[PDB]
UniProtKB/Swiss-Prot annotation:
The chain holds residues 309 to 348 of 414 of the full protein. Hyperphosphorylated in hippocampus, neocortex, and spinal cord from individuals affected with ALS and FTLDU. Phosphorylated upon cellular stress. RNA-binding protein that is involved in various steps of RNA biogenesis and processing. Preferentially binds, via its two RNA recognition motifs RRM1 and RRM2, to GU-repeats on RNA molecules predominantly localized within long introns and in the 3'UTR of mRNAs. In turn, regulates the splicing of many non-coding and protein-coding RNAs including proteins involved in neuronal survival, as well as mRNAs that encode proteins relevant for neurodegenerative diseases. Plays a role in maintaining mitochondrial homeostasis by regulating the processing of mitochondrial transcripts. Changing A7T: In ALS10; triggers mitochondrial DNA release into the cytosol, which is then detected by CGAS, leading to activation of the cGAS-STING pathway and autoinflammation; slight reduction in interaction with PPIA/CYPA. This is TAR DNA-binding protein 43. Homodimer. Homooligomer (via its N-terminal domain). Interacts with BRDT. Binds specifically to pyrimidine-rich motifs of TAR DNA and to single stranded TG repeated sequences. Binds to RNA, specifically to UG repeated sequences with a minimum of six contiguous repeats. Interacts with ATXN2; the interaction is RNA-dependent. Interacts with MATR3. Interacts with UBQLN2. Interacts with HNRNPA2B1. Interacts with ZNF106. Interacts with CNOT7/CAF1. Interacts with CRY2. It comes from the Eukaryota. It comes from Homo sapiens (Human). It is linked to Amyotrophic lateral sclerosis 10: A neurodegenerative disorder affecting upper motor neurons in the brain and lower motor neurons in the brain stem and spinal cord, resulting in fatal paralysis. Sensory abnormalities are absent. The pathologic hallmarks of the disease include pallor of the corticospinal tract due to loss of motor neurons, presence of ubiquitin-positive inclusions within surviving motor neurons, and deposition of pathologic aggregates. The etiology of amyotrophic lateral sclerosis is likely to be multifactorial, involving both genetic and environmental factors. Consists of an N-terminal domain (NTD) and two tandem RNA recognition motifs, RRM1 and RRM2, followed by a C-terminal glycine-rich region. Contains a nuclear localization sequence and is mostly nuclear; however, its nuclear export sequence permits it to transport mRNAs to the cytoplasm and even to synapses as part of neuronal granules. Ubiquitously expressed. In particular, expression is high in pancreas, placenta, lung, genital tract and spleen. It is found in: Nucleus; Cytoplasm; Cytoplasm, Stress granule; Mitochondrion.
Length: 40
């Protein structure tokens, strides 16, 4: 899971949204779980 669920159909002829998203995005450096679980 990157961050996007559900199979959605799209046809970026521009990748136009990607342009704005690239700037809209924000870092600082991560966030992720160091240890991965199996049970649940």
């Amino acid at each position: 899971g990157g961050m996007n669920f559900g199979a959605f159909s799209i046809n970026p002829a521009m990748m136009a949204a990607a342009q704005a998203a690239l700037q809209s995005s924000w870092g600082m450096m991560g966030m992720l779980a160091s240890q991965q679980n199996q049970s649940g």
